[PDB]
Design a binder for this molecule. Structure first.
Ligand SMILES: *[C@@H]1O[C@H](CO[C@@H]2O[C@@H](C)[C@@H](O)[C@@H](O)[C@@H]2O)[C@@H](O[C@@H]2O[C@H](CO)[C@@H](O[C@@H]3O[C@H](CO)[C@@H](O)[C@H](O)[C@@H]3O)[C@H](O)[C@H]2NC(C)=O)[C@H](O)[C@H]1NC(C)=O
Ligand SMILES: *[C@@H]1O[C@H](CO[C@@H]2O[C@@H](C)[C@@H](O)[C@@H](O)[C@@H]2O)[C@@H](O[C@@H]2O[C@H](CO)[C@@H](O)[C@H](O)[C@H]2NC(C)=O)[C@H](O)[C@H]1NC(C)=O
Ligand SMILES: *[C@@H]1O[C@H](CO)[C@@H](O[C@@H]2O[C@H](CO)[C@@H](O)[C@H](O)[C@H]2NC(C)=O)[C@H](O)[C@H]1NC(C)=O
Ligand SMILES: *[C@@H]1O[C@H](CO)[C@@H](O)[C@H](O)[C@H]1NC(C)=O
Ligand SMILES: *[C@@H]1O[C@H](CO)[C@@H](O)[C@H](O)[C@H]1NC(C)=O
Lengths: 209, 322
């Protein structure tokens, strides 16, 4: 038996009213730790707050949609626990009004679109975003973050080499498509000013001819 | 080969007008321009796809209509069978990258000079100035007064009022009126071909400077709704919103300090916002509060809240036993 230890801690977010915010928390231990989301010590409970579990059981995502200001603006915490031990990590949510949005906040110039790929062929979701500073593009599938961490993986992330003037191009490339890849993908643009979500796009996988 | 799929910029044109398709990779994806790619010993090739996923026979360029100029493809003129995706490939022996480019070739809508599903869209506020531009004309641009670009309204010539000012590729309306709604068409000669671009104009009220206006219920009276224990209660709030842009209206119920939308319950809940009236671009909207089996705890003050960039306003209702 080992106590819970974090493999992924949530980071502070600055979102925009009516939009989405996702907090990620993953831990490991023996037995498998449970994860709970709190605000001021109290487990969150709210129609607009959804906790989505990883298939691994490695953790959960706290998703707030649509964002409301100033109610949602607060300090939240992830708490991981089993009978051997307990660990927690805090995180801040900030929500701005669109009228309040600064020059240099990420915008989605174009977001992913409905795509139908047959099984085992490559499917690509495209995202174009801009901002100052230049935004990082990340991906979420069915409310969980797409992991492109490992190179030589089935799923890879492409990034525009970037001349100054145009939006940044980002893509999610899924080789050897399978039925489990089917789902609702959304692109996410982030910089030091904040975070913005594209609209959702479904990927369908039809049978190989 | 690292594939970027279909580029964001799409080309849609009327069968018979010239169109030049630039390779997207230089104009976004990669840092360098075309000449430098060649100098550095990279190849540029064009292939044509019928759609996703159909796979690509190379382009059979002649030299007249479908020429393969420097960093782009030129069509002179466009043909109907030219519709499709045009993959733009770049190569080392150790490096490859390609993007596909959409090209749609439509027909005049019957009796009209545009194609409906093939149009630009703009918006303007009443009493303010709007500028419509002719685009994308970069290539058919000429540095002389003639030929000049002709503007149609509903695909017909009209005597333009003088408040409307014309420059080279733009049309200026110094004060937008409800009459100015509709389909504007620019026409250019070059080739000699004919290039036409239509933008549809929708008009809205100016950006309001006042908060929204409560109707059901009112901002002063404490209206009262009667209900029985163990019944259902639909407390409907109805409000007016001026034009504040592409933002959705923020109308919501509370109960004291408690927001309804923040309650995980099957007993109480707000409905979805209803848009009851919409007119350029001012709305009357409705959101309702439902309680399904009236407990005694339910009774009491509910207040409907209504917000805008200019302010927050609320009106209260008292729920009470028969
Ligand atoms: C909560 O209450 C509102 C108020 O409507 C009611 O109207 C009368 C008939 C009386 O019963 C009143 O006591 C009460 O105020 C309900 O809103 C209404 O919803 C209906 C849809 O079910 C709308 O009717 C039409 O439906 C047809 C489809 O057959 C459409 O084509 C029409 O365009 C229109 O939508 C109606 O306009 C709407 N009225 C208002 C004022 O909002 C509501 O259904 C009810 N329950 C909720 C919100 O859960
Ligand atoms: C293959 O080409 C790359 C250089 O890629 C670029 O190609 C064009 C798109 C344009 O952007 C040019 O200006 C570039 O040259 C070569 O790899 C590069 O090698 C340099 C060596 O210092 C290195 O700094 C770069 O990071 C390399 N680029 C990449 C993408 O790895 C490579 O040598 C070429 N191969 C052959 C056989 O010529
Ligand atoms: C501008 O053109 C559009 C079509 O491109 C017109 O929209 C049509 O309006 C009629 C009104 O009865 C409808 O029956 C059609 O279905 C509409 N077509 C489309 C594609 O929306 C519109 O009327 C024109 N604007 C003006 C001011 O005449
Ligand atoms: C683009 O190519 C031109 C030659 O046409 C060259 O002069 C220029 O250096 C290139 N661009 C940049 C940013 O250097
Ligand atoms: C093509 O557009 C012109 C407008 O210049 C119109 O007169 C003509 O009728 C259109 N063609 C058809 C087949 O409707």
């Amino acid at each position: 038996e080992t106590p819970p230890r974090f493999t992924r801690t949530p980071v502070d977010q600055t979102g925009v009213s009516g939009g989405v915010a996702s907090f990620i928390c993953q831990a490991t231990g023996d037995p498998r730790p449970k994860i709970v989301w709190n605000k001021k010590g109290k487990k969150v409970s709210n129609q607009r707050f959804e906790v989505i579990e990883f298939d691994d059981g490695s953790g959960s995502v706290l998703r707030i949609q649509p964002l409301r200001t100033p109610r949602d603006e607060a300090i939240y915490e992830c708490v991981a626990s089993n009978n051997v031990g307990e660990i927690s990590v805090s995180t801040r949510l900030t929500v701005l009004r669109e009228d309040q949005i600064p020059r240099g906040f990420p915008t989605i110039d174009m977001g992913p679109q409905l795509k139908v790929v047959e099984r085992t062929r490559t499917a690509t979701m495209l995202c174009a975003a801009s901002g100052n500073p230049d935004p990082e593009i990340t991906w979420f599938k069915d409310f969980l973050p797409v992991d492109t961490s490992n190179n030589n993986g089935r799923i890879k992330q492409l990034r525009s080499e970037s001349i100054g003037g145009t939006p940044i191009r980002g893509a999610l490339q899924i080789e050897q498509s399978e039925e489990s890849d089917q789902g609702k993908y959304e692109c996410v643009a982030t910089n030091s000013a904040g975070t913005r979500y594209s609209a959702p796009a479904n990927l369908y996988v039809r049978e190989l001819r | 080969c690292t594939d970027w799929s279909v580029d964001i910029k799409k080309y849609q044109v009327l069968v018979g007008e010239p169109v030049r398709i630039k390779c997207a990779l230089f104009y976004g994806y990669i840092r360098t321009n075309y000449s430098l790619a060649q100098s550095a010993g990279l190849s540029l090739m064009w292939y044509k796809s019928s759609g996703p996923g159909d796979f690509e026979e190379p382009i059979a360029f002649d030299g007249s209509r479908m020429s393969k100029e420097e960093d782009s493809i030129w069509f002179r003129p466009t043909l109907l069978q030219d519709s499709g995706l045009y993959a733009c490939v770049i190569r080392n022996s150790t490096y490859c990258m390609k993007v596909s480019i959409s090209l749609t070739v439509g027909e005049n809508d019957t009796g009209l000079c545009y194609n409906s599903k093939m149009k630009y869209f703009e918006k303007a506020e009443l009493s303010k100035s709007k500028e419509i531009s002719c685009r994308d004309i970069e290539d058919f641009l000429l540095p002389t007064r003639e030929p000049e670009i002709l503007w149609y309204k509903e695909c017909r010539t009209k005597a333009w009022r003088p408040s409307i000012v014309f420059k080279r590729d733009t049309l200026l309306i110094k004060e937008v009126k409800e009459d100015d709604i509709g389909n504007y068409t620019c026409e250019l000669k070059y080739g000699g071909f004919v290039v036409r671009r239509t933008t549809e104009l929708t008009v809205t009220a100016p950006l309001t400077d006042k908060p929204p206006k409560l109707l059901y219920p009112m901002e002063s009276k404490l209206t009262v709704q009667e209900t029985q224990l163990g019944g259902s209660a639909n407390l409907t709030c109805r409000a007016f919103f001026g034009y504040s842009g592409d933002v959705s209206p923020l109308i919501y119920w509370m109960k004291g300090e408690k927001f309804i939308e923040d309650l995980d319950e099957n007993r109480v809940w707000e409905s979805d916002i209803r848009i009851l009236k919409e007119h350029l671009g001012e709305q009357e909207v409705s959101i309702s509060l439902i309680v399904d089996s009236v407990e005694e705890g339910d009774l009491g003050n509910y207040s409907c809240y209504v917000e805008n960039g200019n302010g927050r306003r609320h009106a209260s209702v008292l729920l009470h036993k028969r």
